[PDB]
RNA sequence: UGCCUGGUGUCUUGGGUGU
């Protein structure tokens, strides 16, 4: 919900994903490089607030221009036995060894967009042509050619 | 066998930016005007100020693919606590008797200042440094 | 549409050998082993078992691509030992370790049942 | 040389500590339990009538995820390895579901308890959907109102979680070693002090904390591993552990046989 | 009610707290020291009501770079959800329905009147930010 | 629309994705696209057996064929032929076989601004439905994997295939004639991981070194001696990186007048392909001129330079996979000691602006020549506020530790800059619309929440807060105005630039 | 004229045992059968098919 | 919608003005040709009858 | 209408939760505003 | 009775071995 | 639409706990306490029951298309 | 012996995707 669009690059099975000490594997891994240039801090704040809410069984209130601060959410998260900033010690799926860097980890609301690759893939060797110009027709639905 | 040998007293130990790497500066006890600036691994060979180190430089450990050393074989490194291997990338034939040798042990740098007579034999491609304490 | 069948991760075609061994002539007494329909589960186990043998001087493996289920392993032993014998010794040793682990777990489970 | 010490034991989860094994062996065991232990799950759905508000393939996907008792699945054969034409009793289990709502008011819930085993291997304890108790209704499958009926026939086959996640016997395998970070395998992010900003591990009391004057030990390796195995009920925890060990042994034995037959 | 032309002649307070006269996390209010005293005539009901329907879905829109808010406003109209409850009896040219919609854990107060809780268009995924294997660059 | 540019046959289009495990000049092609497209191969006595096998396999099995063309020009369709096995191929016939591995294909992304937007790759058939690119070529194409699509064109002749493989090939396009510097370099997490991996205090154990060495395709089978032999054999990251660099490469760079002892590990010195000191980052393996890539291309040629990308990427990606890297909300937070400094700096700047306002209102303000009193006043206020934001950002940046992830990404040059740190941590700053502060849209004020004739910094679009701290409604609206101006400016200037370039080309 | 074209068939061997399909191509000894279960079409030898008839399933003697 | 079209375009109509506060959404606008010309009412706005 | 049991239970839960929220959130806001005032 | 009816000193005896304004209790019907 | 059979992240079976969860919420228990009483420890499982919206109760209100 | 099929509007407009 913060303009962070992307496409699936590869799918790993349950046993190939990194896991935390309590066995939680992520559903989805995004690159750290998406954050600094675009400055979507709201993404990180939403992840932290959602983590606290799912731990405590509440729904976070992310209304803008309120008195919510990151430190209050961090205190709540620390009181529940997690690192206050949301980091987690995470293990490597392939070898089982600990990762040297801790991983920001939590639930976030994602939405699936209408643009799927199977509705865009198109190839043409030969096919219908226009009557006037005898050049390939236009359109993926009509088995057309590329300009 | 050994191309240089001396005993150094550590003047300064600088951790600075890093956690596992320390800069140590030492001067030879038997001969001043010989300086040693060196990078070491703290976790394997920790040092403190005013320590005494026996530093030896050799061009070979004898008495191309690397292999884990068999327990049966013996080499020059059996007498020391910290052995590194590096390449000499600068041999500054400086002033009348000011010679500087720069050696890089895979990014961990060493500079050895001294007279020509002491460091004449250190004009090699690769050097082992053997440190005892 | 272009998604491969999931059983191709572990079901071996008839014409594809499970285990192809080719020597590596760049260094003495080295072989390259190509495992088909295998992944990190067997590879890491074998690699870390072989790394402890005093007569094995180089062992490594890599998975070329996550979308293909195979890995290739490089093994290189001392002059006395043929690498394939070292691989067999590693397999047998891990089997014995697993056997004693199973026996001990069964004993403990019966005690704490 | 390897040792096992059990902390807690239950029908559905066991918490144990492995020691004197390599990290690779423990991780391979975890991976094998997660994705290579065979179980039994519904793999074909023949929909004879479905007038509910859910799509046919919606209900098929829901059915495939229902755990079935897979105790004697070793005796069972793989579908592709059975020479029988079509499916026999030795490579498939047939379950049937029939649900209907009577009366012109109210809503009927369709539970997994309504799945009735029709045919299967003789005297093998496989195929029955897992129930927590004798009075547990089970997984909610669908809902029906008046004049809506669901009548399906499902076939269960043997497979592994590599092919599809519905054949996975485990839910989540907690895995952990070196609570006090004596090996320095991780470097702790911090703002002021790394010691008081990081929560203690749940096994921190099982190992002595390092002494203030202790030096780093470069000769140490991870030696004790704490892991918890949770199952979905299709297999007991001890069965999952033992069958993971057996599967790993079979894989290694197959490799050994290939090597010996190569010459 | 006031329109765009009557607003020229009124003095509005942002919050009811503005009607009366050292933390590193909380935000800083305007000092407004140019005027010795103020005589407000109106007060905003709630400042977060300056947003539209699509921009009322973003959580913490004030912690974001504004072009990202615009991009999300654009992309929220392409998220598959449940457009209506009677999708079975409708014959539309296209229709996309998500199997298992979930309501967001971090919601906004304006989502109550957009029925986003009852017809949500997304799911809560466990997201990890990491350079794992180089396939997410 | 029909003579200068026309629709063409033998082409494909689909979404692109990234693959770290592809060579620089390789593209991953789905199986369905490979089956649909074709290349007419002339039957000779070097390939008649293989072509007969392809004809037998038919148009549905890969590798296969779609048509057989006789000498007279008649086409035999293999879908509708009941006696495909009863076809004997004569020399000189053509078989329209399927697309296969190592076939050169032209690859293109729109808009094609320069000649590096069309380059010829080598086909590799892969499952799933997306084109796959090595990530180093995403720079010349100006492409990323958030939904972009790219075009593929198949040559249909021996002459055209030779032209593509000898002129437009990706390795030949590494150095551009526009600025005589490389257009492809190490990017994104490979850049971040080569900075992290080549730090002075990165040591690697034997078992990981063996795996890292086996990953290098060009490795010669000799393991280098470890930097530390006793008590424990340890290799440094610089050694494993030097493994990937071809021998005979010399590179020297001085950063900030550093000495040969490099106390800060800056600068660079590569002797015979071995790194002596210096952290490898954007200044070395980036796309700038005089770096490692430019040196290798000038010295060894396009083939070795193309292999260099693969070697470096594979080693660094394995190391970073087994090490890890992340970013969190805790990385945008500065301690109270720095927050009080930032607050003091901002308050001092606001006091200075207030004094300037008083001086201008009492006719005590000096006038810049060539500018009116109002223009000079506005320029001075804008300069003061920009200096305020820069000072606060500098304080925040100096606060950050070495383990801060944002600082690591900025230092590596992979993503972000100093202004991003300043705005996320310290102060968003002054919002400018059309090069000036926020105008007085209402009657002598910017918003109905301010009194008339108010020139204070917060009344004309100075966002005092940071993104972490959150923006007040007025700052939110002003920042939205500035962002809207940016979007409009982009969407308008693009058409003017396109027209200018078309006129220049014509 | 390929009497088994456009007829419901069931697979008895291989990796698709017990899946219902419809025969689409009947060139010879390699039948193209679209599967009802996923949305795909696969080749299959004639020996692996069970052609539906008025009385149960019949092997490749239809 | 603002029917100014594409011919004779200018940046001023497309801009977000001060007087838009509270009446139209500052964030929601299309991309490309219609940026700024297409507006969305704020969540409490109305139109006089 | 003859609502189902689950819907009736959900309605009761919603009423209870609405009342509890209206009480507790207001109390917390009143507690916070006085502290912000006295600072 | 409830926790409120407990004596304040006895409430002080209830020590964990306050609500926050931004944690709502979930609903299902919303409003409008 | 209807409570998922398995938790997406780990795979715990949560499809048999919807009715018990509603019964617990009916008795006045808080959502966190209700989720704890069902032995849902990991927050990946807790989000499945906590954020589920039950839409089948709205689809069932339409008159069935057959009889 | 009963024997198998390739052929696809145009013009406007509108909403979108990637730069
Ligand atoms: Mg893009
Ligand atoms: Zn059978
Ligand atoms: Zn779960």
TrEMBL record, chain B:
Keywords: Nucleus. It is found in: Nucleus. It comes from the Eukaryota. One of its GO terms (molecular function) is DNA-directed RNA polymerase activity. GO terms for cellular component: RNA polymerase I complex; RNA polymerase II, core complex; RNA polymerase III complex. InterPro entries: NA-bd_OB-fold, RPABC3. The keyword Nucleus applies. Signal peptide: none annotated. Transmembrane segments: none annotated. GO terms for biological process: termination of RNA polymerase I transcription; termination of RNA polymerase III transcription; transcription elongation by RNA polymerase I; transcription elongation by RNA polymerase II; transcription initiation at RNA polymerase I promoter; transcription initiation at RNA polymerase II promoter; transcription initiation at RNA polymerase III promoter; tRNA transcription by RNA polymerase III. Belongs to the eukaryotic RPB8 RNA polymerase subunit family. DNA-dependent RNA polymerase catalyzes the transcription of DNA into RNA using the four ribonucleoside triphosphates as substrates. Common component of RNA polymerases I, II and III which synthesize ribosomal RNA precursors, mRNA precursors and many functional non-coding RNAs, and small RNAs, such as 5S rRNA and tRNAs, respectively. This is DNA-directed RNA polymerases I, II, and III subunit RPABC3. The lineage of its organism: Eukaryota, Fungi, Dikarya, Ascomycota, Saccharomycotina.
Automatic annotation (TrEMBL), chain F:
Mg(2+) 3 binds at residue 148. It comes from the Eukaryota. It is found in: Nucleus. Residues 1-198 form the RNA polymerase N-terminal domain. Mg(2+) 2 binds at residues 146, 148. Mg(2+) 1 binds at residues 144, 146, 148. Belongs to the RNA polymerase beta' chain family. DNA-dependent RNA polymerase catalyzes the transcription of DNA into RNA using the four ribonucleoside triphosphates as substrates. This is DNA-directed RNA polymerase subunit. It comes from Komagataella phaffii (strain GS115 / ATCC 20864) (Yeast). The lineage of its organism: Eukaryota, Fungi, Dikarya, Ascomycota, Saccharomycotina.
UniProtKB/TrEMBL annotation, chain H:
Residues 1-45 form the RNA polymerase Rpb2 domain. It is found in: Nucleus. DNA-dependent RNA polymerase catalyzes the transcription of DNA into RNA using the four ribonucleoside triphosphates as substrates. Belongs to the RNA polymerase beta chain family. Component of the RNA polymerase II (Pol II) complex consisting of 12 subunits. This is DNA-directed RNA polymerase subunit beta. It comes from Komagataella phaffii (strain GS115 / ATCC 20864) (Yeast).
TrEMBL record, chain I:
It comes from the Eukaryota. This is RNAPII-associated chromatin remodeling Paf1 complex subunit. It comes from Komagataella phaffii (strain ATCC 76273 / CBS 7435 / CECT 11047 / NRRL Y-11430 / Wegner 21-1). The gene is RTF1. The chain holds residues 395 to 433 of 514 of the full protein.
